[PDB]
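User: I'm designing a mutation panel for Nucleosome-remodeling factor subunit BPTF and want to avoid disrupting the core. Could you give me a predicted structure to guide residue selection? Please restate the sequence first so the numbering is unambiguous.

Assistant: Good idea. Sequence first, for numbering, then the predicted structure tokens:
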Amino acid sequence: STEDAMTVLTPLTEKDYEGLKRVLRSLQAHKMAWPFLEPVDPNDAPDYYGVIKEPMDLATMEERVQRRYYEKLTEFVADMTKIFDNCRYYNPSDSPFYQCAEVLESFFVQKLKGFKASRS
Ligand SMILES: CN(C)CCc1ccc(Nc2cnn(C)c(=O)c2Cl)cc1
């Protein structure tokens, strides 16, 4: 669609980056974001970094947003998706972390759709 191709191809502008920061800030304020605010502490999960190839967290994405690391929205969505995919890969489905990933990913999808709608 218009938004799917924009998402893949349209370079992110400074104006886009205001929208990206708003989305990230709203995730960081969400009640269910607590497991994802900061990198996974190895002492919470001793085998985590031997298993998870590309860790991700909201503080690392905040740094990348500040530095204009992302050229396309697809790259931003991929980093965010890693947070939730890593969590569901490593944890059982009845884990509170896994449940937080399900709730926060649905919230991110709601916010991401709003952001894509306003790029016009
Ligand atoms: C040092 N801490 C006890 C602080 C509390 C805390 C912070 C973040 C997490 N986040 C984790 C942890 N372990 N694993 C396997 C995960 O997947 C995730 Cl998302 C947990 C506790």
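For picking mutation sites, this is relevant: Residues 35-36, 40-41, 44-45, 48, 87, 90-91, 97 surround YOV (CB under 6 Å). Residues 96-118 form the longest helix (23 residues).
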